[PDB]
Symmetry: D2
Subunit: 400 residues, 4 copies
Amino acid sequence: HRALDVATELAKTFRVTVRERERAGGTPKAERDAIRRSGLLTLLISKERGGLGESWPTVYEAIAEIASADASLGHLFGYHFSNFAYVDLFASPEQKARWYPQAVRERWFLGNASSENNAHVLDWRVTATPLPDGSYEINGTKAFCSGSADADRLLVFAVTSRDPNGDGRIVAALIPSDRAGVQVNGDWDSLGMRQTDSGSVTFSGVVVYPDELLGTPGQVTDAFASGSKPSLWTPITQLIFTHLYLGIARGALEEAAHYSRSHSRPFTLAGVEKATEDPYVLAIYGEFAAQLQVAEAGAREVALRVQELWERNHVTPEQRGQLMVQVASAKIVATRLVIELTSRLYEAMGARAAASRQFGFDRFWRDARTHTLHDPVAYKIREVGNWFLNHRFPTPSFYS
Amino acid sequence: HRALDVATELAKTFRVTVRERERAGGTPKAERDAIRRSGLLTLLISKERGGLGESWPTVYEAIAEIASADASLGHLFGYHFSNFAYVDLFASPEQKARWYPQAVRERWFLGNASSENNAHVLDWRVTATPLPDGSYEINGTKAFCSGSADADRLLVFAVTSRDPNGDGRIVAALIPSDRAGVQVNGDWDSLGMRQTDSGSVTFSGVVVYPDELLGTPGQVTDAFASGSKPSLWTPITQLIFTHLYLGIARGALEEAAHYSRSHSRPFTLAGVEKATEDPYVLAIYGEFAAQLQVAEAGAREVALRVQELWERNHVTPEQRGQLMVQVASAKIVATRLVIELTSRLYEAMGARAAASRQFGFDRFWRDARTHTLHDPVAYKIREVGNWFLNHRFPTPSFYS
Amino acid sequence: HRALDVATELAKTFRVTVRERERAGGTPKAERDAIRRSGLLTLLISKERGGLGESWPTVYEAIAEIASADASLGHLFGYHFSNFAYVDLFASPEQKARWYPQAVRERWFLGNASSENNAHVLDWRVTATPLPDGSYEINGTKAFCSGSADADRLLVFAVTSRDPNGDGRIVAALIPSDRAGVQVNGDWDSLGMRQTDSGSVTFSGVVVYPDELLGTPGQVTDAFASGSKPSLWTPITQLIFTHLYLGIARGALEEAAHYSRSHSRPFTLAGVEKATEDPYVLAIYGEFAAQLQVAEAGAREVALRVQELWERNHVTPEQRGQLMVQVASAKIVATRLVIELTSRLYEAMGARAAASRQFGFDRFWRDARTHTLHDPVAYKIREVGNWFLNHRFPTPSFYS
Amino acid sequence: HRALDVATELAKTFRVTVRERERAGGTPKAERDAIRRSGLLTLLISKERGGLGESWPTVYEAIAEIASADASLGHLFGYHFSNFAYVDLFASPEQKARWYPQAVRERWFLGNASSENNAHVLDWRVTATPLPDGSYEINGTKAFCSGSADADRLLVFAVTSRDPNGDGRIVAALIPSDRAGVQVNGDWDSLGMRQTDSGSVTFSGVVVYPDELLGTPGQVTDAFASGSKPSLWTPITQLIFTHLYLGIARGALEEAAHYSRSHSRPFTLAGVEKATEDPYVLAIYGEFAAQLQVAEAGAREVALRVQELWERNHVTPEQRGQLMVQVASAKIVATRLVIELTSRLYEAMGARAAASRQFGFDRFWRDARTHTLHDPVAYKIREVGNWFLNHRFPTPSFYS
Ligand SMILES: Cc1cc2nc3c(=O)[nH]c(=O)nc-3n(C[C@H](O)[C@H](O)[C@H](O)COP(=O)(O)O)c2cc1C
Ligand SMILES: Cc1cc2nc3c(=O)[nH]c(=O)nc-3n(C[C@H](O)[C@H](O)[C@H](O)COP(=O)(O)O)c2cc1C
Ligand SMILES: Cc1cc2nc3c(=O)[nH]c(=O)nc-3n(C[C@H](O)[C@H](O)[C@H](O)COP(=O)(O)O)c2cc1C
Ligand SMILES: Cc1cc2nc3c(=O)[nH]c(=O)nc-3n(C[C@H](O)[C@H](O)[C@H](O)COP(=O)(O)O)c2cc1C
């Protein structure tokens, strides 16, 4: 439990300043460096390679703990492990032997540049065009590039173009953020998740060398269509999001409870002597704490299943599909819970909790309301319904 | 329909600037002056006294229309009529014969200084010390003094102190906001309702003259206990709040719909080609628009009953109680609706509606979330339940 | 108020026996005859023609009152007026001159045979094949033939076949239920609505004469698609259903409250002395009574609009579409309300309310759960959402 | 897995006949004997004592599985284990060394006579009069005596009377159901749970011998008041109820999906071609299936903790209190889930699922609606809220 103690202490520190930092937005550089010093970025790197040799259940618990104190830092930390999972699922033995000790020594905090801001989410326009000696040149602009500021390496996705071995193939690469031609645009100005640096990144003639490629071009599509082990990336990542939402929920509920204990006034018109004894205050806390207990317990079980399949040589389509259904189910419940809780808890605290903007409790709703839109919950619900009613597992992709 | 056309045009101009104004907070002086020039502040003053001679249904519709454009201006406008209602219900005919033509000629926008920030509501510390001529000296600081800035008159409440005829009796008065010793503090920095100037007002040896007093000391308490006509102030005022919530709800729905038609991207992963044809987008708009239609139609009926009883010379506790139950019911439904809709509509718009803070759609949730806490909806629910189950009307108070 | 008093007295008598009668199912002949004797079946026939010359608001109020006592009799009564509305919207002047005095003299209680049990609700197979002199022969089986038992006339729909003047045209006719070849099958055995006689009817060579046809074949298709006056039939009929749901809701809430007052035990483990003072019991009654008040007040406004347009010579598509949206909205809210209330009120009553089957409170849920499925509320929601978001009124049909 | 295979095959046979059997009510003797022959009643008896030596996780899974097929048999089975848990927690080793091999040999199916029908749940009036030889005489009538028909032993609770060492002290005993003076009244006629035989039992001069007593008089009260290991009986039992609700929920969902696949018709008015592709049908299954997955996963974690503490020699009030909070939270979520889905799934099936009573789907709602009233969920919610807000564990009792 040493790693979780480390995460708990980080979270405590972040809570002290999150109110003022998230107002300003921008890059939480000091807090990112605190995460570097903690070593937790190396949780899944083997001890032999210099990491902590820890497990996914620990990573998930740490994500929720940090997110409960600062949702932006929880998101950055969580997405680091989504990026790491992708790297680990496609990297060669040579790449792991080079990169992982380097990630330990240089304290890599990974960012990504994957999504785009085109007509729809499947309209990708960032191209990878072949060069001599096996290299590729990346051109175009990516959107929602979380952790792209102060990132040591960027996980980047592009589609092959002018490629004699096949156009339209997805290439993934891990490249230095300061590689020439990479421009992080710094245009993130959001309702919530204000310190995740999820703005755009423009690629102008950016060179990617063969030893930076994560598999051959198109390999990710073959792995997902086949149900190869890399198809675990989506359930892993969607469960990361789930833990952000449960962390935010728990942080909001605890912050509200402290306010209620120390600051709410009883509704003496109704004969209440203390707000903490009000039957309707107690019902609000009870209803949301109860849902939270069940969701947290369920999320621990699914995190253990992630670890179990992570360790297998092969995961069957049924095993992967069942995990994705469990993860989607957890994300659905956690989305509804955090969105309702962060708004309705004001009713347990009273008017003065909103009358002073500086109390800042709305940060929880703003953070949850922003992130829960990452991909539409309505279609996670449809996927679970299509599974239960029609016995169809979701189609492996970057979103399901 | 002339008055409502005037309200509609005011609201149109307010929508142009509200995003920028509400950020700054402070006093919306230009907009208050526009309301002054419109004549609508005189809606309920009889034509004989120079007013518009209009009805509460008209007032309520105008409140909801303005609130749908700018919740702070809707609140200020609405609370002006709560203040006016108190004056009308307690002032003498001679006082009205003087005050109402003056309010017309001088374009009075009324403010109030009633509530306080003590161990609980109704625990009042602003004192009224009797002077030999029948005046009172007012001392103390009032909290949540909506519309206290730029107010032509303040409706003020105090409790008697050092009073040979009984301490602790509530006195009320209508006084100039620049009476010697009145300090409007401007200490309002809130989550939402940011331009309602609901900070505090400090009374330092403020003299209130006998022709400014509204009834006799304790008369408001006696009227409450009797459930007589002056106790209509509470259902009238609670239905004003109800129309703020309905106006915010309608403004949010229409604003989101504009975004959905103009900006939302179709979820092509699921085969949808137009966001406006997405079955789940359509279901969100349908669920909330349907509830809004029913709540608005119901509110019109209650508003008609307010006007009926407003015109009566005498009102029974049974008539007032039945009206209060109907008002509480409307407020309950409007409260649930606006709080759910202003949060969940993001799910119909997509991530970019939250990713771009400057869209500013969160203003609707912030305004509704702030104001709905004025008094706890849990006890409005208990009051309707106690009536339905036990045939007990709500105990008249400043909140029920 | 005479008609409503008559309806209230009928509902009083129905409440005495409904628990016993609905167990058995089958035809409530005695109660149908009491409705015949009351004269209320003639509410919408002019006084000149021997009817009551009343209005739709009166009809809707009577439907809700009767439904609150006996949902099956409320359904039968309401469907009689849906059938009458169709007749009145399509009948020729000479048909009305003969039928309406006859309906008064003979105390007609109308039923219908319209829907079918094929692959979907558009798949009609009951045919109308030409006979000499403009007659038609009807062949096939109808489903959900409400009020088909003990009916003085049946409103029957068929599609033309082997017709030189056009196949597939919808014909409607008003015929005697004992005409040769009409077989009411008596196979209604339902979860709720158990005495509506909504079973199947089989037509074997049934002759229909020109003076029984309601307009020419295909006229209803043109009238609905063009928005001519008969397009009011659907909002009229869907608002009849809405008043069934509001009646059941009010009846269930009043029956539960009586049980709570006289039988529920206090949860003394928590220090409650009387169940009627329990804060959570009170909150259940409060939530549902509040929603019921708002829904009922709203429904009264829409009922008035039905009458206003009923008296118009021409109704525009805007007027008809806005009315249909208001009716759909009322139906959506009433549907959610009655389905939740009839199940959740058990929590305000306690285990003995379900443990003693003979209490029979589940009749309310059974009746509402059955009838609310008449057409899917999900698509009423979509219709309201398509209007709000896309400014598209519902396309007139038998369901919208 | 052997035990769960046996439970699954029992459930499969129960599904074939439940629709017909539960209509009649009365005692499901053939199915109770099948459970006797299966050996599963011995799940928690050690192999050393002739039992299966299984764990609470297995018992809970078997309870949910059987309940998904027949809620009454699931309840009888689950309450047998509540009865057994009480015996295990209070009987002496010497008693258990005799009783448990006997229960294996004679295939004992336990019932109980505990609750009463007095002014409130704390008002007990069945008395235990001490006789000079250490025996007692039991007199009075118990209510809700689940599994009292065809019971091999009854777990009976009484309060001491005529007792020189203290009246009102709770005694418990395990006695034959055919002991002279025991009259099972057979008056159970309920909305749902119709074959649980939970009617009244009358004791007339019933002798209880010293070697049948469970502990000393008042010992259960002492154990509750100290939060010691015997007070685990309540979280154990409340988690049994939770698994009944999860089982009913899963059974209802599966039955509905079979109808949706086989019988539901597409809503062609809206262009749907297959009901199983309808977006709103899919959303209903997805929402409820997702909540079920999360609740089932959380329930498994809590079941493991039950086993952990069950194996401890001593349990602290903190351990017991934390467990009770986790169990209460699971019960709250499962209660809301089962009550909502057993009613709402009709909207995914269509009207004919209710219009054909013989389909019998309402059994799920009737069973769930009946059993969830066992104790009020509002106070489970208050208990979780009092823990979260005020750090107060539930006061141990027969309900918390
Ligand atoms: C936006 C807003 C405006 C308010 N305006 C007034 C007002 O004009 N006059 C008044 O007496 N109280 C006003 N109140 C105060 C409430 O009546 C109540 O006293 C207070 O909100 C309760 O505080 P609590 O819930 O934190 O204990 C206002 C409250 C809010 C949130
Ligand atoms: C706070 C936030 C962070 C996001 N971070 C990433 C990211 O790191 N990588 C990525 O590919 N997409 C990221 N996304 C994008 C989503 O996958 C998706 O592209 C976006 O929500 C679609 O926007 P729309 O709903 O307006 O069409 C992020 C979205 C949000 C709201
Ligand atoms: C289906 C059902 C079965 C029950 N079985 C038992 C039982 O076996 N033993 C027991 O002590 N109480 C049993 N109870 C009763 C509860 O402990 C409690 O006394 C009862 O639900 C309270 O009734 P009330 O809410 O009407 O006041 C049962 C209740 C129901 C509804
Ligand atoms: C209680 C009840 C009464 C009904 N009465 C009629 C009726 O009188 N005339 C009619 O055309 N349809 C009637 N319907 C049927 C609907 O128009 C529609 O055909 C049916 O509810 C759809 O069935 P499904 O959802 O199982 O496919 C009735 C339905 C119910 C549940």
